[PDB]
């Protein structure tokens, strides 16, 4: 051991609070356990993310933590197999070395939130995706589909619009949906930023929220109760996920007592933006 | 030299984008220049922030960067005097070793924004502060007072309410202003989060924005043009400040040609939330 902890900086600053919380807690744990915290720049590709892991392995960090934007889960499994130093993965699910990853069931989480809309009487529900290549975005669209299929609703492909996680893309998403004449009493945006953009575009086109269109988001950002109307959103337990990944790492390095690996999912917080049609 | 760069993690993640941007660019520079980037936890006091600096100095980082929440500017000046390794300070103004600090004139920035409200015809202007012990919040309230004084308006202390940088505290701010019967056609929140909270409380009390009350904030967050109405806000050039602090540090360690040290200020972006009364 070198008494050294590694963290890959990825292009995920501002994409929820995952990275900054990971950073905060990893800094805290490193100081408490008396080890050095090293940063590596993962830059802007899968190869560069791998290089950043490799650089920390070469300097012989006892452990490495990463929330990967480009580097696939399968490639990381291979790196974990090749090295005795634990590589911890946040917000992804590893197939082989699953105890090295802490994840949230974004598919089931989306399902449940869409199911609550159906149970409140919404039959025609629009969906605004995040980025096409985003694992979380793929899972949230899957959960939406799965919820429609299990409640006997036919998949209307007109009701699904592409987004980019940004407020602009949320406004554009509504703009697209209204132009192709899609009809809906509810809209699910894949994050709160897109939802606020969606609500803005709906307001500017004379569509009442929640009276005509109910709106939900994901993230439960601090701003959400203070929108007009107050934004219903799915809270993800990010802090608990971070505490889980740190605790799991402490055990892998130092031992001590064991805690049964938790699984995580979110919950919809109903607010003024969601009613029954 | 050990080819090592130090960064103090402080209680300032989510307090604007200062620390996150600093971390990004410090990570990039360290990789480009082939040096290791070390983190130290500055925790939750002035003493703990000093300890973090000391820990990095003891490990012999060539340089240390910090955005200090608790640790005084005068104390940091002393530490810089005692050590040959550059300690760089973001978003604070050092009195003696001023080339080690990159700062924004938050007082003048606030002044200018409040001056634009006066020049648009607002005479009674409410103010929501950030935290009492925040340097930026002190500076912004000072600029507000300075603007009222120079445009011949009497300081009405009833128009000033305490806040905590959060959306809740912005709503509470409006609540307290309305209860003590303060009259205003404009409101300045010290950040966008407070402004959105303020606008929510104003809407729930039947006060029209911008028709009755114009609202401005600070930060220019990505959400701002998508609020109802679109939030006018002061944009701080954070990214230029970070490039400035990194550029200075490159010169101090590796040498070369430098840009003459800049100083920085923000400007108000006018949006739908701001008009001319009545």
From Swiss-Prot, chain B:
It comes from the Bacteria. One of its GO terms (biological process) is DNA-templated transcription. GO terms for molecular function: DNA-binding transcription factor activity; sequence-specific DNA binding; transcription cis-regulatory region binding. Keywords: DNA-binding, Repressor, Transcription, Transcription regulation. Repressor of the asc operon. The cryptic operon is activated by the insertion of IS186 into the ascG gene. This is HTH-type transcriptional regulator AscG. The chain holds residues 58 to 335 of 336 of the full protein.
